[PDB]
Write an enzyme that holds these catalytic residues in place. Structure first.
Site, PDB file in Angstrom:
ATOM      1  N   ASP A  21       0.776  -1.240   0.000  1.00 43.20           N
ATOM      2  CA  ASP A  21       0.000   0.000   0.000  1.00 43.20           C
ATOM      3  C   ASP A  21       0.816   1.303   0.000  1.00 43.20           C
ATOM      4  O   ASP A  21       0.407   2.333   0.521  1.00 43.20           O
ATOM      5  CB  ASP A  21      -1.049  -0.007   1.119  1.00 43.20           C
ATOM      6  CG  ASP A  21      -2.229   0.930   0.833  1.00 43.20           C
ATOM      7  OD1 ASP A  21      -3.148   0.954   1.672  1.00 43.20           O
ATOM      8  OD2 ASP A  21      -2.331   1.676  -0.185  1.00 43.20           O
ATOM      9  N   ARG A  48      -0.304   9.001   0.842  1.00 42.54           N
ATOM     10  CA  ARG A  48      -1.014   9.095   2.109  1.00 42.54           C
ATOM     11  C   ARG A  48      -0.401   8.210   3.183  1.00 42.54           C
ATOM     12  O   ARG A  48      -0.709   8.373   4.369  1.00 42.54           O
ATOM     13  CB  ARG A  48      -2.506   8.759   1.933  1.00 42.54           C
ATOM     14  CG  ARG A  48      -2.813   7.269   1.987  1.00 42.54           C
ATOM     15  CD  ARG A  48      -3.941   6.804   1.117  1.00 42.54           C
ATOM     16  NE  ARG A  48      -3.786   5.401   0.765  1.00 42.54           N
ATOM     17  CZ  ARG A  48      -3.936   4.946  -0.470  1.00 42.54           C
ATOM     18  NH1 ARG A  48      -4.253   5.792  -1.448  1.00 42.54           N
ATOM     19  NH2 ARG A  48      -3.775   3.651  -0.742  1.00 42.54           N
ATOM     20  N   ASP A  75       1.577   2.663   7.535  1.00 42.71           N
ATOM     21  CA  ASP A  75       0.537   1.707   7.112  1.00 42.71           C
ATOM     22  C   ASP A  75       1.039   0.368   6.591  1.00 42.71           C
ATOM     23  O   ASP A  75       1.072   0.150   5.369  1.00 42.71           O
ATOM     24  CB  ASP A  75      -0.338   2.315   6.030  1.00 42.71           C
ATOM     25  CG  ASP A  75      -1.772   1.842   6.093  1.00 42.71           C
ATOM     26  OD1 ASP A  75      -2.611   2.623   5.592  1.00 42.71           O
ATOM     27  OD2 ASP A  75      -2.149   0.757   6.622  1.00 42.71           O
TER      28      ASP A  75
END
Ligand SMILES: Nc1ncnc2c1ncn2[C@@H]1O[C@H](COP(=O)(O)OP(=O)(O)O)[C@@H](O)[C@H]1O
Ligand SMILES: [Mg+2]
Length: 292
Positions: free
Chosen positions: A157, A161, A175
């Site tokens: 991912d 962001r 993340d």
């Protein structure tokens, strides 16, 4: 049959445990698909008398099995990788007497994505957001991604962001909710019918459900795209359906951002090769940036 004992699958180390009543919550820092992250103070988290500032990550209320499992999965990963300047520093968890709280080093500027959009309207070169700064973030994420890979991990991912930024223009990847350890095969196959960050996904992962080391490379490309467009959404206005899938397969890609230098577009594109085995490794991206 035999397996490489996967460090990120290992039951959990109680050495991270930090009593939650020693934590306190400030304003919410963000929320993605998996967790909610909140700012916090950890009293006595390193020095017996700390009052350290931290990021605490926790499930969103009414979260599902997937969200649940993932938060533990990243406790376990963050744990395995340990300190590295460009990854997010894990400093604790609370698993006892309330929801799983995952404690992380506070990055004071937040996600590049958000940071980029606050500072887009102020971008210049040679000096406030720099072109050197953008380069610098390209280097640091590739550096960090090259580190994950050596540690046999794929982020799954990588996006603007999920990159944090702290004070010395130093960037941290965060993340690890979709991150897996790839030592056993490489070709890690997505079992679940999942809900994934498709616009950041390499075609082989969309169509053949396979993620590899060179598939984070694809996403790193969509991320150089996010970086140099000063925080634009990839394929803006474009819904993910058959029209989007087909433009990826037939080999269409995004144009240079008006702020990307030629060599950074060049890397992106090689990161976007349809052939997985033609993409450069982050190791090679790292060295490709250090000539700039
Ligand atoms: N360590 C941290 N320090 C500062 N901000 C953070 C930190 N961790 C997460 N964030 C913020 O919270 C947002 C969500 O974090 P992330 O771990 O990606 O959660 P999710 O899995 O829900 O996407 C990030 O994009 C970032 O803005
Ligand atoms: Mg996120």
């Amino acid at each position: 049959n035999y397996v490489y004992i996967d460090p990120t699958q290992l039951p959990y180390d109680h050495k991270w445990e930090f009593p939650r009543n020693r934590l306190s919550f400030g304003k919410t820092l963000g929320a993605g698909a998996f967790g909610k992250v909140v700012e916090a103070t950890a009293y006595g988290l390193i020095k017996s008398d700390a009052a350290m500032t931290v990021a605490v990550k926790m499930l969103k209320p009414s979260a599902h099995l997937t969200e649940r499992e993932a938060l533990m999965s990243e406790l376990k990963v963050l744990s395995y990788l340990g300190n590295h300047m460009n990854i997010v520093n894990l400093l604790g968890a609370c698993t006892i007497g309330g929801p799983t709280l995952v404690i992380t080093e506070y990055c004071c500027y937040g996600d590049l994505l958000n940071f980029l959009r606050r500072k887009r309207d102020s971008f210049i070169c040679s000096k406030a957001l720099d072109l050197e700064d953008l380069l610098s973030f390209s280097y640091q994420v590739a550096k960090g991604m090259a580190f994950l890979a050596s540690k046999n991990c794929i982020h799954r991912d990588l996006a603007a962001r999920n990159i944090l930024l702290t004070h010395g223009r130093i960037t941290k990847i965060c993340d690890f909710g979709l991150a897996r350890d790839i030592k056993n095969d490489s070709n890690y196959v997505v079992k679940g019918n999942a809900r994934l960050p498709v616009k950041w996904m390499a075609p082989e992962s969309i169509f053949n459900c396979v993620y590899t080391f060179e598939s984070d490379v694809w996403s790193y490309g969509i991320f150089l795209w996010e970086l140099f467009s000063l925080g634009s959404s990839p394929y803006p206005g474009m819904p993910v359906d058959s029209k989007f899938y087909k433009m990826i397969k037939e080999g269409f890609r995004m144009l240079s951002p008006e702020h990307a230098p030629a060599e950074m577009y060049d890397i992106m594109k090689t990161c976007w090769d349809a052939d997985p085995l033609k993409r450069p490794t982050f190791k090679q991206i790292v060295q490709l940036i250090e000539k700039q």
